C-alpha cells in the first residue's frame, strides 16, 4: 500500500454506459450573427469507451426541419478494461466471464495487478477476506484476456466488478457492469 501503484481503495470504476443519451432540447435564442445563432452547450460525457454519434434536428417555422449531419466524438484512454458480460446467466450454472485489458501505449509493456471484486451474490475465488488477483503483462498495442470463472447465486440483477492498476505509472481503471440472472 506504498508500492509504485494505485490502490483499490482509490480506484473509482466506470459504471454509466447508456446506449443513447443527451435526449435534450435547446433553443437558438442567441444573438444572430451573419444570420447564424450559436449556442454553446455544456455536456458531460458518459463512462463508456467508444464513439458517440450526436444527431441534431432543428425545427423553425421560418425555415422548417433540418437533419443536421452526424457529428462524432471519441472517448478513449491509453489503458482500460473491457468487461464483456453476456446478456443473461442462469442462477447456479458456472460460466467464465472475460476481462479484456487494453494497452494502447506506443512502446512499452504494461504490468497490471487486475482483480475481480468479491460479490456475495456470486461464487468466485474471491472471499470477504481473500481477494482474487493475478499480476499480468500486456504487450504494447494489444490486448490481454483475463478469465474469471464464477457462479451466479441469486436471481434478478447482479453485478460483476473488475479493477486493474498499472505499475510505475499511476494509471487505473475499474468497470462495473450488470447482468441478468435468471432461475432455471
Amino acid at each position: 500500500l506504498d508500492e509504485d501503484i494505485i490502490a483499490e481503495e482509490n480506484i473509482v470504476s466506470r459504471s454509466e454506459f447508456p446506449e443513447s443519451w443527451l435526449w435534450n432540447v435547446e433553443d437558438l435564442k442567441e444573438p444572430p450573427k451573419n444570420g447564424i445563432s450559436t449556442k454553446l452547450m455544456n455536456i458531460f460525457l458518459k463512462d463508456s469507451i467508444t464513439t458517440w454519434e450526436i444527431l441534431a434536428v432543428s425545427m423553425s417555422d421560418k425555415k422548417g426541419i433540418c437533419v443536421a449531419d452526424p457529428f462524432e466524438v471519441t472517448v478513449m484512454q491509453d489503458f482500460f478494461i473491457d468487461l464483456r458480460l453476456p446478456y443473461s446467466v442462469v442462477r447456479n450454472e458456472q460460466v467464465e466471464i472475460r476481462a479484456v485489458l487494453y494497452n494502447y501505449r506506443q512502446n512499452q509493456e504494461l504490468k497490471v495487478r487486475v482483480e475481480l471484486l468479491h460479490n456475495p451474490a456470486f461464487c468466485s475465488l474471491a472471499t470477504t477476506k481473500r481477494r482474487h488477483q493475478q499480476t499480468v503483462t500486456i504487450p504494447p498495442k494489444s490486448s490481454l484476456s483475463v478469465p474469471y470463472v464464477i457462479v451466479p447465486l441469486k436471481t434478478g440483477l447482479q453485478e460483476v466488478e473488475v479493477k486493474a492498476a498499472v505499475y510505475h505509472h499511476f494509471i487505473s481503471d475499474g468497470v462495473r457492469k450488470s447482468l441478468k440472472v435468471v432461475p432455471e
Binding site: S58, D61, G64, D69
Partner: protein
C-alpha cells in the same frame, strides 16, 4: 378581344395556403375580380372572401391567396369548382383536392432496443412546405405481428412541430421488427411508419465492413469477386483477429448460399483480403451459360473474431450486381417532347449498377462522333442536339464511351421524343434553354426565352408569363417583357433556398393570329437544385483544439443554426449501429419524401399547350374556353 386566364395547382390541399394566377390579356383600365370556391357539386361557398383588381400598373397580373377549411364533407375523389369573376365575365374550373395534410417523420433514439429498455421517439409534424404546423396526430405502436399494443392522441399546437414521446418495452415480448405508425387525425389513409428491432444483445466493441473492389461483378471477370474485410473498434483503433467469409447469389428475394465459397482469413492490422472465384460461383449453381447469371446479385457475410475470443461481429454487404456493363443509362430526367428545329437539351442519367450516380463518365448519341459530354458530380450529362423541322418522332439512343472498356462492355438505352403539337398546326413554338449545372441558392440562373414563329405575328407578342412550382405549390409567378424582332430574352432568376430541392418553370404566351384564332404557346422545365437543409444546422466541437476527452469528462458542444430555431439532441453509442443501422432519420430521407409527392410528373414540356400545363402541377382555364385536361387522378401516371 380581351381574354382572362385562370391558373392553379393540379391538386389543391386542405388547411394550407394555395395561390392562383389572375391575368387580363388585352384589356383596358382597371379590372376588379372576385374569386370563390364551392364544394362540388352544388353550393357551400367554402371561400369567397378574396377580392382583387388587375391594374394597368402591374400588367394585369393577379395574386390569389386562399385557405380551404375542412368541414364535415369515401374511396371516390372529392373535388371543387373554383370561380373567378373579372368584372361581369365569369370563368371557372373543376379541380381535384386531397385530404393529405402534409408529412410526418418519426425518430427513435436507437435503431434497436432490448426487452425492458424504453424507446424514445419524436414525431416531427409539418405541412407540404416542410414548415412546422400544428394539428392532432394519432400514434400506434404495432408489434411484429401487426397488432397495435399502444396508441395515444396528441396535438402539436404551440409545440413548434415537435412531439416528444416514449414507450416502455415490456420484459417478455416478441423479438422482431416493431413499427411506429402515425397519421394526421384529418387523414387516416396517409399513414407514416418507422421501425425498430427488439432483440437480445450486448453491444459489440468494434464494427466490421465488407467491400468489393467493384460495386458489381463482371461475368467475364476471370478474377472472381474480390473483397476487402475491415475491422476497427468503436474508439478508433485497428483490430486483430480472424474472420470467416462466405458468399451467395440472390434472385428477387430468393437466396442461395455457395457453401463452398467459405473461407477463413486472418484479419491483420484491421484489414483482410478475400475472394469468391468465378469457378465456385458457377459450380455453386450448376455450371451453365454464365450469361444466365446476368441480372442476379451477390452477397458476402463476414464474421470477425478477436483473438481474445471475447467479442464477435457479423456484417454483410448485400446485392452486388452481376452485370455485363459497369454503367446504366436513364432518360427519366429528360423530357419526352422536343420542338422541331430547336435545340434539345438532353439530360442523360448515368448510374453505377448499384444505383449511385457515376462521375466523369463520357456519353454521346448514335449519329455524331464529335459530340461528347461528361457527367457532373450528379451523375448527369448535358448534351444538346439541333433537331430537324420534320413532323417525325425523334428517336435518340445514347451510349457510354469510356476508354478501357470494350464496345460490348459499354451500355446504351433508347428513348422516343415527340414534337410539340401546336394549335391548328401553325408552327408557333417557345423554347426555354437553361444552362444546366448544380444550381445553388444565391447563384443566379439565366432562362433563355426563345421565340419560334413567322414574323407575321412576332411584333404582337409583347410578354412572357412565367411560373414556379416547388414542393407542389406556387412559389412565384411573373412576367418577362419582350420587344419586336426579339426571339431571345434572358430572365435573371435569383435562386433562394425556397427553391430546394427542385423547382418547375412554366412560361406561356398568348395571341390572336393566322385566322382570328386565340392561341396559347408554352414550355415547362425541371431543374433539380443542390439538396441541403433550407436553413442550417451544424454541431461541431466546443474546444477549438484538444486531445480526446476522457470517460465522464466535461466537453463543450457547439451548435450553429437558424435564429429562434429549436434543436433536439441525442447521442448514440455507435456500437448500436453495428447491430442495426436501418431506419435512421436523414435529411436526404426527407427530400425523398418531398419529391415523391410532386404533382408534376414530367421532366419538361407538354404534348400540347394544354399538356405543359397538366404535366407540371397546373391547370389553365381561360375565358376563350381553352382549358386544360381536367385532373382527376391523385397520383401520377402509374408507371
Amino acid at each position: 378581344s380581351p381574354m382572362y386566364s385562370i391558373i392553379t395547382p393540379n391538386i389543391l390541399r386542405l388547411e394550407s395556403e394555395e395561390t392562383m394566377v389572375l391575368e387580363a390579356h388585352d384589356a383596358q383600365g382597371d379590372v376588379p375580380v372576385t374569386v370563390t370556391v364551392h364544394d362540388f357539386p352544388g353550393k357551400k361557398l367554402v371561400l369567397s372572401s378574396e377580392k382583387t383588381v388587375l391594374t394597368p400598373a402591374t400588367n394585369h397580373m393577379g395574386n390569389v391567396t386562399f385557405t380551404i377549411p375542412a368541414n364535415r364533407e369515401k374511396g371516390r375523389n372529392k373535388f371543387v369548382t373554383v370561380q373567378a369573376t373579372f368584372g361581369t365575365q365569369v370563368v371557372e374550373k373543376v379541380v381535384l383536392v386531397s385530404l393529405q395534410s402534409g408529412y410526418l417523420f418519426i425518430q427513435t433514439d436507437k435503431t434497436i432496443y432490448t426487452p425492458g429498455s424504453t424507446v424514445l421517439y419524436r414525431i416531427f409534424t409539418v405541412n407540404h412546405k416542410l414548415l412546422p404546423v400544428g394539428r392532432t396526430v394519432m400514434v400506434n405502436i404495432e408489434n411484429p405481428e401487426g397488432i397495435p399494443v399502444k396508441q395515444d392522441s396528441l396535438s402539436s399546437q404551440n409545440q413548434l412541430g415537435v412531439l416528444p414521446l416514449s414507450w416502455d418495452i415490456p420484459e417478455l415480448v416478441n423479438m422482431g421488427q416493431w413499427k411506429i405508425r402515425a397519421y394526421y387525425e384529418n387523414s387516416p389513409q396517409q399513414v407514416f411508419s418507422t421501425e425498430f428491432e427488439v432483440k437480445e444483445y450486448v453491444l459489440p466493441s468494434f464494427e466490421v465492413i465488407v467491400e468489393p473492389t467493384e460495386k458489381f461483378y463482371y461475368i467475364y471477370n476471370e478474377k472472381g469477386l474480390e473483397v476487402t474485410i475491415t475491422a476497427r473498434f468503436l474508439y478508433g483503433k485497428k483490430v486483430e483477429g480472424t474472420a470467416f467469409v462466405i458468399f451467395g447469389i440472390q434472385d428477387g428475394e430468393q437466396r442461395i448460399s455457395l457453401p463452398e465459397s467459405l473461407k477463413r482469413i486472418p484479419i491483420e492490422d484491421g484489414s483482410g483480403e478475400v475472394v469468391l472465384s468465378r469457378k465456385v460461383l458457377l459450380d455453386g449453381v450448376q455450371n451453365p451459360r454464365a450469361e444466365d447469371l446476368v441480372g442476379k446479385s451477390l452477397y458476402v457475410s463476414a464474421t470477425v473474431i478477436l483473438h481474445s475470443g471475447s467479442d464477435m461481429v457479423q456484417a454483410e454487404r448485400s446485392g452486388i450486381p452481376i452485370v455485363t456493363s459497369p454503367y446504366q443509362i436513364h432518360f427519366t430526367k429528360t423530357p419526352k417532347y422536343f420542338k422541331p428545329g430547336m435545340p434539345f437539351d438532353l439530360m442523360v442519367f448515368v448510374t453505377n449498377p448499384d444505383g449511385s450516380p457515376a462521375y466523369r463518365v463520357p456519353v454521346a448519341v448514335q449519329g455524331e462522333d464529335t459530340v461528347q459530354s461528361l457527367t457532373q458530380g450528379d451523375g448527369v450529362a448535358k448534351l444538346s442536339i439541333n433537331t430537324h423541322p420534320s413532323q417525325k418522332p425523334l428517336s435518340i439512343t445514347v451510349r457510354t464511351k469510356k476508354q478501357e472498356l470494350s464496345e460490348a462492355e459499354q451500355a446504351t438505352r433508347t428513348m422516343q421524343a415527340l414534337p410539340y403539337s401546336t394549335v391548328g398546326n401553325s408552327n408557333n413554338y417557345l423554347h426555354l434553354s437553361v444552362l444546366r449545372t448544380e444550381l445553388r441558392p444565391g447563384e443566379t440562373l439565366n432562362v433563355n426565352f426563345l421565340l419560334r414563329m413567322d414574323r407575321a405575328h412576332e411584333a404582337k407578342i409583347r410578354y412572357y408569363t412565367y411560373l414556379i412550382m416547388n414542393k407542389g405549390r406556387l412559389l412565384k409567378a411573373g412576367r418577362q417583357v419582350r420587344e419586336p424582332g426579339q426571339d431571345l430574352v434572358v430572365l435573371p432568376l435569383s435562386i433562394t433556398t425556397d427553391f430546394i430541392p427542385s423547382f418547375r418553370l412554366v412560361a406561356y404566351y398568348t395571341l390572336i393570329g393566322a385566322s382570328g384564332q386565340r392561341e396559347v404557346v408554352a414550355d415547362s422545365v425541371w431543374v433539380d437544385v443542390k439538396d441541403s437543409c433550407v436553413g442550417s444546422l451544424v454541431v461541431k466541437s466546443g474546444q477549438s483544439e484538444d486531445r480526446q476527452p476522457v470517460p465522464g469528462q466535461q466537453m463543450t458542444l457547439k451548435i450553429e443554426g437558424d435564429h429562434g430555431a429549436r434543436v433536439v439532441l441525442v447521442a448514440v453509442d455507435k456500437g448500436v449501429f453495428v447491430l442495426n443501422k436501418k431506419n435512421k432519420l436523414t435529411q436526404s430521407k426527407i427530400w425523398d419524401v418531398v419529391e415523391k409527392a410532386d404533382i408534376g410528373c414530367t421532366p419538361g414540356s407538354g404534348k400540347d399547350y394544354a399538356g405543359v400545363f397538366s404535366d407540371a402541377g397546373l391547370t389553365f382555364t381561360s375565358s376563350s374556353g381553352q382549358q386544360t385536361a381536367q385532373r382527376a387522378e391523385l397520383q401520377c401516371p402509374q408507371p
